[PDB]
Every structure is written in C-alpha cells, then in structure tokens.
Amino acid sequence: SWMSTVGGNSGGAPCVFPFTFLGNKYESCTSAGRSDGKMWCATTANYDDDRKWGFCPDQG
C-alpha cells in the first residue's frame, strides 16, 4: 500500500490488508464501527486484538 493513515489513532501507520474487524476480513477500507461517513482501515492484521485504526487514504 505504502499509504499512511489519517484519523484513527495510529499516527500514520500503513493499513494492513486484509484486516479483520469485528469478525469480517477487510480487503479494502471500511466504514465499520462508524455511523458518520468517514471510511477507515486497520493498521494491524487482526483489528479485534490490536484495535489500531486509521481513516482511509485518497479514495480517488
């Protein structure tokens, strides 16, 4: 990916795909756990454990 994160709380850590959130494997960004609109990505292989996340990069 070579992409740092925004949002979240990683501080600019690359999204690790596929990342599993709340039971599902995410190969792309997600809006899971969010009821706003900003999509994010986990910065760890298994989010359920590490729970380290960050918003999705350029979605262009």
Curated annotation (Swiss-Prot):
PTM per Swiss-Prot/TrEMBL: Phosphorylation on multiple sites modulates enzymatic activity. Phosphorylated by PKC in vitro.
Tissue specificity note: Produced by normal skin fibroblasts. PEX is expressed in a number of tumors including gliomas, breast and prostate.
Superkingdom of origin organism: Eukaryota
Intrachain disulfide bonds: 15-41, 29-56
Inducers of expression: Aspirin appears to inhibit expression.
Domain Fibronectin type-II: residue ranges: 10-58
Domain topic, free-text comment: The conserved cysteine present in the cysteine-switch motif binds the catalytic zinc ion, thus inhibiting the enzyme. The dissociation of the cysteine from the zinc ion upon the activation-peptide release activates the enzyme.
Function: Ubiquitinous metalloproteinase that is involved in diverse functions such as remodeling of the vasculature, angiogenesis, tissue repair, tumor invasion, inflammation, and atherosclerotic plaque rupture. As well as degrading extracellular matrix proteins, can also act on several nonmatrix proteins such as big endothelial 1 and beta-type CGRP promoting vasoconstriction. Also cleaves KISS at a Gly-|-Leu bond. Appears to have a role in myocardial cell death pathways. Contributes to myocardial oxidative stress by regulating the activity of GSK3beta. Cleaves GSK3beta in vitro. PEX, the C-terminal non-catalytic fragment of MMP2, possesses anti-angiogenic and anti-tumor properties and inhibits cell migration and cell adhesion to FGF2 and vitronectin. Ligand for integrinv/beta3 on the surface of blood vessels.
Disease: Multicentric osteolysis, nodulosis, and arthropathy: An autosomal recessive syndrome characterized by severe multicentric osteolysis with predominant involvement of the hands and feet. Additional features include coarse face, corneal opacities, patches of thickened, hyperpigmented skin, hypertrichosis and gum hypertrophy.
Sequence similarity: Belongs to the peptidase M10A family.
Subunit details: Interacts (via the C-terminal hemopexin-like domains-containing region) with the integrin alpha-V/beta-3; the interaction promotes vascular invasion in angiogenic vessels and melamoma cells. Interacts (via the C-terminal PEX domain) with TIMP2 (via the C-terminal); the interaction inhibits the degradation activity. Interacts with GSK3B.
Protein name, per record: 72 kDa type IV collagenase
